[PDB]
Design a protein around this ligand. Structure first.
Ligand SMILES: NC(=O)C1=CN([C@@H]2O[C@H](COP(=O)(O)OP(=O)(O)OC[C@H]3O[C@@H](n4cnc5c(N)ncnc54)[C@H](OP(=O)(O)O)[C@@H]3O)[C@@H](O)[C@H]2O)C=CC1
Ligand SMILES: NC(=O)C1=CN([C@@H]2O[C@H](COP(=O)(O)OP(=O)(O)OC[C@H]3O[C@@H](n4cnc5c(N)ncnc54)[C@H](OP(=O)(O)O)[C@@H]3O)[C@@H](O)[C@H]2O)C=CC1
Ligand SMILES: NC(=O)C1=CN([C@@H]2O[C@H](COP(=O)(O)OP(=O)(O)OC[C@H]3O[C@@H](n4cnc5c(N)ncnc54)[C@H](OP(=O)(O)O)[C@@H]3O)[C@@H](O)[C@H]2O)C=CC1
Ligand SMILES: NC(=O)C1=CN([C@@H]2O[C@H](COP(=O)(O)OP(=O)(O)OC[C@H]3O[C@@H](n4cnc5c(N)ncnc54)[C@H](OP(=O)(O)O)[C@@H]3O)[C@@H](O)[C@H]2O)C=CC1
Lengths: 243, 243, 239, 239
């Protein structure tokens, strides 16, 4: 019938918000998780209450077989895969001199290999449709760099190149590939001190933090027919922090 | 009551299309023109048939008093100015060695000074509202440069800096300032030869030209509540030509 | 046997670029708008380096005056190998406050100026089939800056012009590039400016000669495959 | 009295960077993965320049091997003033076809490698309170490239790492920068490649030494205010 989506890391935070938003615009949504089965299942129902179809599917994005099993299963339930949103991601923060090998390895695994994994395994099916929209999550630090986050930054910049390169491969066959880059978004920011919040806000011309839903909005737009001539672009949603 | 817009150079092409699109999303629209009174007046009615309010207003954007008179008049009719879209623009193409002084002067006047003119004169009113969205038209060549168009390119790049700088000034007061950059869009392209079209298409991974409405779509999105955390950004709508 | 022309070479960054080009063996023509004395003083510092040098008065925003200037440089030196478009002004104001004259004047010197120089310098560089053109931009041309919508416009616009000229002139041996300095010491304007200092990872203001080093490098045989580029020289304040 | 380490310095671009650093007075340590003979040959060409030099075998994707390598460079030269992260591989394939090993291997050498070198080289450069690190990226890191989603990922990722390390190490005198070469002659792989040539305004492929010139420049006292930057060396193919 209508059109359907997969969001990685959609059990909580921006992913949850993205998925809900795709439900509002009428996508059936698959809610990937790594370990939070119950919160996923909860979002699966929050999505149903929107009158569309949903289910949770567990899978570590760093592992290529689990990703293949996931795509196969979303195609099996839904009949198609119209929108892929690669949102799953971890930080393991340290100055370069204190960074352990497993803090590098793991971040790359999830944040960069994961996105490649998801992109690759979603491709036979999108080429079959001759249609599709892939949106990757990056971050303001992917553009400006940030001390203490070299691994994470490497992933986010790298994600942006993966976007351009994928965009280039699949363009002629109906598939757009894009990135969204959030600046400071309310999440944890909810037990930070006044001193620190104010330090953060002086970096943001709009003088406020961003919301879940600002990111969700930009993602949906990218997935919508109304954006099918946009490809290989990163949209920065950061209230002016980086221009 | 509801919310209202001004589009410069909206008598034809992308401007026309933008304005219509703002009418669909329910803005009252003012249709600025420089000289094509009748085509403007026609678009004014195309807009009314959308159930919203409209009128034409003539004004050369390069002249600061005429721009002030225009803003004053849009505020007088509408009660507000919620969206300003600076679309008016001319080319005067020549290699640098053949470029006459009036070919430089004129392009700068319209394409760069004009946008400054429109931005400045729209500001007392947007600061009064403590709300607003300004969207500037640029172009793929603003990013990559292009032989034979040094004047035009200078304007389009410069427009992009004007966007960042304006974005920075007005951010704390509720106003977002952004740019859209079209690649190859169907317009004149309608009497070009096969040989040339194909030469143009091999530059575009999506392997087609863009439409009026792809630009309009991105502009409306930028003007909408759904984008109020986006500022000082240029969106490239170019089917992958530049990433 | 090699020659350069630096616009606005009477003081500050141009003064320093002029000196480094001389330091490296260019005869250097020193352009100024009103600072006759100071420019001739720069001329003397250049002469003492062992190269040839003279002062030339021309308003860069005037094409006839630019043309006359180019012809006189070719006259004295026999060539024009390097053009450094450095002349630049600011008329800062909030958007609300910016006067037409403040916009007009800036766009004229900062952007029309560069166009004129590049244009009138082209035939000579085409006849040599070689040439280096270097344009001063600024960090604010990439990131924007409140108070400066006129200046920012011109500096971003100079980057677009650089690209377009690079592309037009590539195939006949000419490189067109830009340098975008960050917060440089020149223009010593005591205040709450260590706020700016916190924006610079290297934790100092750059110097004159830092920009002069990049400009000289871009002008040498060692950067002949680099064209259309903007080199940010800014201590890391913009990456 | 000044010293450099170049990774992948046995042939191609590293070979040429190693030679230019020597040309300018650095003792140069030549790193290789398997090309012992060719690297020792490079060593000999460097020795004949009047500086000191030796070959050092280490897989950049291995942190222990990188650590050992750094310690041995410090051992022989008494310092590490310049690190040039050049070692790089490609395993090209369409997305549909790319094998896990092809992804893993590339991310490991191209991106994990750079991380390791920077990391293990840091203490030494911090104790000197001075230092230049230069990372090889590529034009395709900025613009993307079909067939190369693994390589592109690493080259864009190396630019992010460069920024982040620039920022972490700025305040103790160290510059971190990158060079992104375009289509360079090295790797002579007769075909329909003049298609690539039409993409280059300068209308020739760049050379080895063109990249070596930029790398040497970035490593010198004349670029000490430049950090976090990517310098595109590409004839204008990407501006
Ligand atoms: N929040 C912010 O201010 C900003 C966020 N970003 C980026 O946006 C994206 C969303 O961030 P945010 O909402 O903060 O994230 P959260 O930490 O809130 O959520 C992490 C999500 O990722 C999933 N996940 C982690 N590892 C794996 C894995 N190996 N396989 C499958 N799923 C995995 C988690 O699943 P599970 O619940 O099962 O653990 C979880 O759902 C990220 O890529 C982040 O880097 C960028 C800039 C700012
Ligand atoms: N078309 C394309 O492929 C691309 C276009 N662009 C840019 O997008 C924008 C729209 O372009 P396009 O649709 O092709 O334009 P058109 O040439 O079709 O329309 C020009 C419009 O600008 C108005 N105008 C010109 N000068 C003035 C002035 N001094 N004062 C007020 N209005 C003026 C004209 O009014 P009047 O009718 O009265 O003459 C007309 O409405 C431009 O800025 C253009 O540079 C960028 C990339 C590609
Ligand atoms: N200082 C900084 O932190 C930054 C500077 N820049 C740019 O660097 C460049 C050099 O600036 P800086 O040296 O600091 O500026 P200065 O104010 O020191 O000098 C300006 C120079 O330009 C000349 N000039 C001004 N108008 C004209 C004209 N119409 N025709 C010919 N020459 C003219 C002046 O000559 P005369 O003495 O005769 O009037 C003077 O030599 C400028 O382009 C500037 O915008 C960019 C980023 C930062
Ligand atoms: N050529 C071009 O047009 C472009 C090249 N670049 C980049 O420039 C850099 C140099 O490339 P180029 O000289 O052409 O490449 P080459 O193929 O000529 O050389 C690769 C070098 O890296 C070494 N190497 C490979 N893996 C390892 C490892 N695991 N540990 C230590 N050393 C290793 C090789 O040493 P050994 O001989 O022992 O195997 C060799 O010295 C690369 O980073 C490349 O990606 C960027 C853009 C364009």
């Amino acid at each position: 019938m209508t059109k359907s989506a997969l969001v990685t890391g959609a059990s909580r935070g921006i992913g949850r918000s993205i998925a809900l938003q795709l439900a509002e615009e009428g996508y059936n949504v698959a809610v990937n998780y790594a370990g939070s089965k119950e919160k996923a299942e909860a979002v699966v129902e929050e999505i149903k209450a929107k009158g569309v179809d949903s289910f949770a599917i567990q899978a570590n994005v760093a592992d290529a077989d689990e990703v293949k099993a996931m795509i196969k299963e979303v195609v099996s339930q839904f009949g198609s895969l119209d929108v892929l949103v690669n949102n799953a991601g971890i930080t393991r923060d340290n100055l370069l001199m204190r960074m352990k090998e497993q803090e590098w390895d793991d971040v790359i695994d999830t944040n960069l290999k994961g996105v490649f994994n998801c992109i690759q395994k979603a491709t036979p099916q999108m080429l079959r449709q001759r249609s599709g929209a892939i949106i990757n999550l990056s971050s303001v630090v992917g553009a400006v760099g940030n001390p203490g986050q070299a691994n994470y930054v490497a992933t986010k910049a790298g994600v942006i190149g993966l976007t351009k390169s994928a965009a280039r491969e699949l363009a002629s066959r109906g598939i757009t590939v894009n990135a969204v880059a959030p600046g400071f978004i309310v999440s944890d920011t909810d037990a930070l001190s006044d001193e620190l919040k104010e330090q953060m806000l002086t970096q943001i011309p709009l003088a406020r933090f961003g919301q879940d839903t600002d990111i969700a909005n930009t993602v949906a737009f990218l997935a919508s027919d109304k954006a099918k001539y946009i490809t290989g672009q990163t949209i920065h949603v950061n209230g002016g922090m980086y221009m």
